[PDB]
Amino acid sequence: GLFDIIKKVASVIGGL
Amino acid sequence: GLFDIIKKVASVIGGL
């Protein structure tokens, strides 16, 4: 779902 | 870590 996409993007940003 | 970030970015692209 879109929300699973946003959650993954959030994790990526958290890992920068 | 890095590898998780790479997989998450890949998953997002794949899912868009």
Author numbering:
A (entry chain B), B (entry chain A): 1 to 16
Lines quoted from the article behind this entry:
Citropin 1.3 is an antimicrobial peptide secreted by the amphibian Litoria citropa (Southern bell frog). In this study, the structural and functional properties of its non‐amidated form, which self‐assembles into distinct fibrillar architectures, are investigated. Using cryogenic electron microscopy, X‐ray crystallography, and fluorescence microscopy with model membranes and cells, diverse supramolecular structures, including canonical amyloid fibrils, multilayered nanotubes, and a novel mixed fibril type, are identified. Citropin 1.3 with free, charged termini, has a net positive charge of +1 at neutral pH, primarily consists of hydrophobic residues (9 out of 16 residues) and adopts an amphipathic α‐helical structure in its monomeric form.
Citropin 1.3 was found to form cubic microcrystals, which diffracted to a resolution of 1.6 Å. The crystal structure revealed two chains of the 16‐residue peptide within the asymmetric unit. These peptide chains adopt α‐helical conformations, tightly packed through hydrophobic interactions involving residues such as Ile5, Val9, Val12, and Leu16. Additionally, a hydrogen bond is formed between Lys8 on chain B and Ser11 on chain A. Each chain also exhibits an internal electrostatic interaction between Lys8 and Asp4. The fibril's surface features alternating hydrophobic and positively charged zigzagged belts.
